[PDB]
Each structure stands twice: as structure tokens, then as C-alpha cells.
Design a protein around this nucleic acid. Sequence first.
DNA 1: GTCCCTGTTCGGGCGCCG
DNA 2: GGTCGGCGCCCGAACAGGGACTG
Lengths: 549, 395
Amino acid sequence: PISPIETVPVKLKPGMDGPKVKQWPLTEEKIKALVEICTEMEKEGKISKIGPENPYNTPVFAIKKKDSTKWRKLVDFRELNKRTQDFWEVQLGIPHPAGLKKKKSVTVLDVGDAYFSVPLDEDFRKYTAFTIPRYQYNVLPQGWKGSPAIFQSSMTKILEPFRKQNPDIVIYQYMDDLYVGSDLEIGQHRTKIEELRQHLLRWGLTTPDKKHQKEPPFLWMGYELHPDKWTVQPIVLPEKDSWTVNDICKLVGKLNWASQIYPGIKVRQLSKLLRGTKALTEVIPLTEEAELELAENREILKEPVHGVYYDPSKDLIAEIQKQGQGQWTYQIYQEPFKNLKTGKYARMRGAHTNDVKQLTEAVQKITTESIVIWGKTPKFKLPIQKETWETWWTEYWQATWIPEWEFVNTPPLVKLWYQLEKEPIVGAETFYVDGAANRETKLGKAGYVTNRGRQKVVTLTDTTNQKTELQAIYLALQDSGLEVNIVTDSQYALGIIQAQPDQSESELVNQIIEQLIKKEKVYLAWVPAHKGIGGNEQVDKLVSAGIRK
Amino acid sequence: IETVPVKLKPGMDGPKVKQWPLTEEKIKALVEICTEMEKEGKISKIGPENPYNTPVFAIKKKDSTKWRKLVDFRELNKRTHPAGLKKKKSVTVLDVGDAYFSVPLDEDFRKYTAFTIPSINNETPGIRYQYNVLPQGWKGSPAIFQSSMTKILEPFRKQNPDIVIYQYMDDLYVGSDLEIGQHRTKIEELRQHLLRWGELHPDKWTVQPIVLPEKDSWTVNDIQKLVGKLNWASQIYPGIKVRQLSKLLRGTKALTEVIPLTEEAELELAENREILKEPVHGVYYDPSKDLIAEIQKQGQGQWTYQIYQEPFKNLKTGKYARMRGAHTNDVKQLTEAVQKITTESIVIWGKTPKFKLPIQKETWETWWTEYWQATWIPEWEFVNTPPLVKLWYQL
DNA sequence: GTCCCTGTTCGGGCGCCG
DNA sequence: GGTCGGCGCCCGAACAGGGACTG
Ligand SMILES: C#C[C@]1(COP(=O)(O)OP(=O)(O)OP(=O)(O)O)O[C@@H](n2ccc3c(N)nc(Cl)nc32)C[C@@H]1O
Ligand SMILES: [Mg+2]
Ligand SMILES: [Mg+2]
């Protein structure tokens, strides 16, 4: 049938006109199925034959389906899409099985040739012209930008009466895929299911029994849903022996997708292998740490794993745990050792950072993702000492926060690796540091003077004012003892080092962190530059020599 | 009722802002409110052929099972004063958004008010609506409801000429020098007035000056911190001088060594203590420029602010002190802060300020709606500050 | 202003669903 | 092979913002 639902009005962009692309070289088997489709659709009113009053054309093709027996008739509207009006996408994200409540009776089903059951707008149907080796669409074509959004809007309009009159049957609606849950006995359930198939039919929408799943395990959205557990459909990893950029991409994609129920997956090293490339085809050597990361991920994926479903009665819990190099894995459950789902956070936000900032970022990620899936926020189990957190959000100048949580002794634990004094150290040598660098030559100097007579000035090449300032701080850390007071006039460096980082994209700052961890009391103070305040003044005359004025 | 044609500014298309994840209770309240607003013809479902979108959520007010829907209309508001009010003893803020719902909206413009309700775990594509009346939260809503509201409030004003009734967005500020009680009773008279057609204290708002430490001993370090703070403040107060204090440091002293304050130093410091008392000179409010607000976290539930427009030309500098408990929610404190500050900036100038928040943007957006309580939403942007300014406004 | 460094967004490739 | 939309991740390119600098 063709839905008697009103067609969504669709125009083109101002001053644009339809496609005039001509067919490409086409294998026959594809053309045989093309015509066998095209002619049955023409029978059904889904495509109408056009003549030469229509100057438009666009390439078509086909592909196998999940069945693999039937054929998907795709059109290649790159040009038409470029010229069609803009829409507001209504698919706002993907449903996740871990946000399914336990239902007494369930069905999954799929709609018969769905796009081709929903009427295109007449005034638009002309730009949908194609020639099979001449028709036009009176329904929704596959490959057109507006067909997703339009289908989904429409399907919602259709289902709206049913949901209104059946508010206690839950209908998860992705594209035409419908999962239907109820708390009824199986009998009355199938009654309500036939009632919904009747409704969909009334709007011209067939639910082929071929795709009408009645018994568990319901195959849905890439998972298998059993009545009290769910699991992801099996994952197979690429097992090459020479990997390329695209072999790598697909590997990381399979991994990320796995990470949602396989706890512990790690992709940072592999991902880092992707830095700097150009084309999909560049074969690249696995580094030993990427190699080993792959090894341990593979080891993970051999084991069995399943989520459960969401009980709103119980609390939501997220527990987080640390791997190296700013990698983090979390598990969200409601009842110990019964994962609702797992995950991983690795994003590196910042030139400089520390484990505490990363943990908070992880918490935010999980909070937003929990809101999406269950509409509420989890309670946390975090490997950070209530003290480490009190100290941190005490001293740190940015607003920062973590919802209800509790500690869990699960090494590695999170700690700040050092601390800056609040007041200057009695008996600690005082270093006035400074650097300066020339903008034309890229020559600079960095050094210090000390209240105890010492003074050092190091020359640098291909450097930057900020770099010199950090170089002088590093120098002073290198040559001082276990307690030192430092005075710099570079709020950039002060701003980095107060933040208490423990990893940096910069090597200079990593060496600096190593020094700061080694000491026992550091005090870092600021003074405005070029204002004659000793001994900022003396060191500034020292490094400004030969590279300034 | 006849409809006022409204258009966008030239060379601007409407808003295209994605809807951000709501919580189950926020969604359910939004859907309740929205089905009744459809039953009353204020909103109409729309499709994906309308490419405009503005976010929507909802707030819970204190101790009342009533929810309020908030549309985040600032992107659209972009695309479209009683100076004695700061001087009243008591000032009550009334919500009067419902009134806008009684006037139709220009049809040509309804497609720009478009919004999408989300659904939990994406059970369902976004459910889209557009506005048929005047929307709560839009710049043009009070613009159009102008004459209607001057009519409505004619008799109440003529009756109580010592009262001030300001309107901004969906809010009505009523200020009077009445006693608490007589004030509240007059407010109830005004509510009964409004229902025929169908608590702030500006006196107690204080500026927080920059202040210098008073000590008996002074160390090399304390003096460098003083000279740094004065050097900065001189950019606001040109009368600040730092000659003498500076010269005391001259040479490569250990931070902990104590220096004694020479007579000129002690006088320069006392004169600089004065100069920081005089108010700022040459700072006049420009209505054609945005107000900017910077907020610094000083710790201990202490939050300092400055409202300005040209750098160093602070229109006002304030502070906001909350519970210093061990259960302090920094985000909660910050939003409560920015709401108070927006109220001050509205009462003083009738404009909202753009904020420079000290917070990771994600951290902000995750929670900040959990604690909102006002019918408007001011612009904001996120900063990565050095604790230099932080150290300067300290106490 | 220019240069330097930090941050954000936006679009590219893969993955996953229909 | 070759189309579309959504979401995720990750990277790089192109921005905006602010501090230090030259004569
Ligand atoms: C609604 C819907 C459907 C459902 O899929 P299906 O795989 O069930 O196909 P169908 O049309 O329902 O036919 P049937 O189920 O009888 O085999 O998703 C859409 N779809 C799918 C793959 C695909 C692509 N590769 N490019 C484009 Cl642009 N659209 C695509 C259109 C189809 O209508
Ligand atoms: Mg189908
Ligand atoms: Mg310098």
C-alpha cells in the first residue's frame, strides 16, 4: 500500500534546480533486480513513468540486504541533496538496551519496504527522476537527505494514536524497527500486538511475519535480548599481519563499540598510531605498546559478558577505574557484578592536565550519558581520596564538582603528585627566574639569580618567549635543593604549574613535573615584569643581553 | 486580535541549536505542560521541514509541585529605565509570562519558535512544536505586549505613585519603601489587579573595594605581593604609586627576609589605601554595548565579581558569600551567583550581562539547569583564568 | 598590530543501527 | 564499488581569546 498520510512539504534551496546526472556503467544482475523492482513499484503506484517533459536524472544502484537474498534499490542524490532545503533531524540518538525495563512480554518487528510506503510530496517528485537501462518517485527514496527525518517524523505521527490509547505498551521506534514491551500475559500481549499491526496497516504499513519476532532471543539494534539479560551480537576483530590506516580505523571502531559491555578495552596506543597520516591506505608498523594493547584487548574479547535491564526501583551506580596514559574505564550497574553497561573515557582535553581533572571529566561524561539512557544521574564509586578531592576543589580556582560519591580502594588510586606552598619557605634558597627570546632570530636565553650569590644563564635556539620562561623555571628546579622559593614574571608558567599537572604534551613541562615531584617544598611567586623589583631586575638584565634592545 | 508582523535582522537566518539531554522529571513535566498547551492552541506540532530549533527544559520552584517550562530563546532574541528602582527598600519579582499567551504571534515568524522535546533513551524521535501565541522568554514578547501592559497597570500606578513597576522579559519588578507586610499586602493588591484581565532589597547592595593587607612586619614576599597588586590596581586608579615600596626591594633578597617600612613607604601605602576608597572615575554606562561580568572563585564559598563594559572601567564590583560547609557545590554556588548578579544588572540597567564563567564548559552545561530559577537566561562564555585577578580581588 | 599558546568547533575517517 | 540520517570516537584545520613583545 501507499500511506494516506499527508506528504511533508519539501522545497529546494533558492535558485537551485534538480539533478541532471546520467547513469553509470551497471552490471546486469543489478539491472535485472532494478527492473523487477521498478516495474512492481510502478504497478503499486510507488514510481510513475515520466516522459521528456522531465529534464532531470540521477544515478541508481543496488546492494544486497541483511537477508542477502533481496536487493536494496539505492539512489545517489549527492547533487539533489546538496540542493534540497535544510531539515531538522529528529533522530536524537540511539536507544540502548541497558535502558530497557523488564517487561513480561515482548515483540520485535520490522516494517515491509518502509521508505516505499510513505508518500513523497508531489510538487517535489520530479527531481527524483531516474532511468533504468524512465520513472519518478511517488514515495520516499533511499539516498535522499530528507528521507530519514521525514520517515521518522511521520512514523511518530502514525504511532501517536496508539501510544495515546495504549500508554502502558512501550514502543521503541528506530527507523521502522519497533520493539514492543508490555506487562500483559502472552495472550493479551499478542492481542495488543495484532491491534498495533492493524493500526499500522490502516495507515498503509505492513508488518511482514518474516520479520515478526515472537520468541526470545529477540534480535534488536545489534543485540540479542533474552528475557533477563542482553548481549551484543558477536564481534569479530580484523586479524591482519600488516595493518593500514583503514584497518586501524575499523579496528578501533570495533573496539569502541565493544567497550560498551566489554570492560577494560583500551585504544589510546592504536589511536595514537593514527597521528599525522594522509590517506586511508598508509600501512603502518604496530609499536610494541600498541601491539601489546591489541593483545590484551583481544584477550578481553574472548570472555563472555552480558548486561541486564534497568530497574528504576534501585539506584544507579557508576564505578570508575584507571589505566595508564589518561585512560579510564567505567562500569554502570545496579547490583554488584551485574553490569547495566560498561564504557571508557580517554579524551585528552588540555596541553597539560592531571589525573584529578581527568577523573572529573570522566564523571561528567558518564553523567550526561546516564541522563540520556535513564534520565537520572548515577551515584559514584571513585578511586580518589575524599581528602584528595577536598584539597583539590579547595585550592583550584575553577568551579568544579562531583555528585554523590564514595571512595573505593582500587589501585591505582588518584592523587596529586605534589603541592605548592602557600607561604615562602624559611631557609629555602630564593631563585629569581626569567627568560627572553628574540622574535626575528629565534635566539633566546633563560636563567636565574639567587639571594645566595649564584647566577646562571643558558642560551636556547629556535625558541619562544614562553618556552624560555619555562626553561628558566626548569633550570632553577634543576639546580636548587629539596626546598626552593621561585619568583617568575610569567603568569603563563605560574598558570600551568599551580594547576598541578602530571602529564603534558610538552616535554619541557614533563621534565618540570619530574622535578616538582622530586622536591619536598616548592613555593612559586609572581611579580610584574620590567618594574625594577630586585632580583627580577638583575636576572632580566642577565637574559636580555644579546637577545634584546 | 490582530497580529504584529515581525522579521529577523537582515542577513540572519533563524536559530539552529540542538536540544540537550533532559532528565526524566524535566521531560515528563515538559510533556504535561506541552500537551495542555496544545489542547489550548498555544503550540502546534510541526515536522522536519522546519529547520529551526531552540532548546527547552523546565524548572521546579522551591516548594510547589508546579513546573515551569523554559525555552532558551537567546539565540533567537539575538536574531530579532527606572533608575530609582535600585533605591527601594523592598522589591518583589513577579512571574507574568502566562499573559503573553493571550496574544497571537505573526504567522510568518512561528517557524522560528520551533523546539523539540526529547525522549528517554531515545524511545522516540524528537517531538517538535512551534508557537502560535507570544512565547515565554522571547525578546519580542514584551515588545508587542507593551500597550496591553501599560493599560493594565495604569490604575494601580495612578493609585500608588510612590511604587515602581518595571518590566523585563517575563518578569515584573515591583519596588516600594513600604514596611515589610504593607509591602506584601500591596503586592497582593497588584496580583489581584493582574488576575482581573487574565523578595529583593536593593538598599542593601554593596560594592566590594580592593583592600590592602595591614601588617606589623613585612617580608620581601609580602611586599612583592603588595607591589604586584598595586601595580595592577593602578590600571583602574591612576593615583596609585609604587615607587617607594618598590625601591625597598632593590636587590636580590630572600623571600623570607623582613624589610621595615620607611616613612615614605608607609605614607605611599597609606595614600594608596585612601585612593582605593574614592570611586572609579569616568565610567559611564553604554546601552549600545554589552555588559560583561567576570566571576572569580576565591574559595570558601567566596565569589567576587566585576561588572564592566570597557576593560578597567568597572561599573560595579561585588561579592557573594555562601555556606562554607564541607558539602559545598561549586557549580550550584556559581549558578546561584550568576542569577543574583543578573538580577542586580537588570535592576541597575535593564540589560543582562554576558558572563565570563570560571568553569569547564561541559561541567557547567551538565548541571547548571539543575539549579536555575529565573525566567531568562543570560549569555555566557567560559574562561581559563590565571589566579592573578583572583589574587587581586581577594580579602 | 605579530607571534605564541591555549581552547572550541567543525568535518573528515572509521564503527554501530535502520 | 557507488547513496542517506542519527550517535560514538578520534584526529587535524580553522578559528577566537589573551598575554608578551619592539622602537
Ligand atoms: C525506514 C526504513 C528502512 C528499513 O530498512 P530495511 O532493511 O528493513 O528495508 P525496508 O525498506 O524496510 O525493506 P524490507 O524490510 O522489506 O527488506 O531503513 C532505511 N535504510 C536501510 C538501509 C539503508 C541504506 N543503506 N541507505 C538508506 Cl538511504 N536508507 C536505508 C530505508 C528502509 O526503508
Ligand atoms: Mg524494514
Ligand atoms: Mg620575562
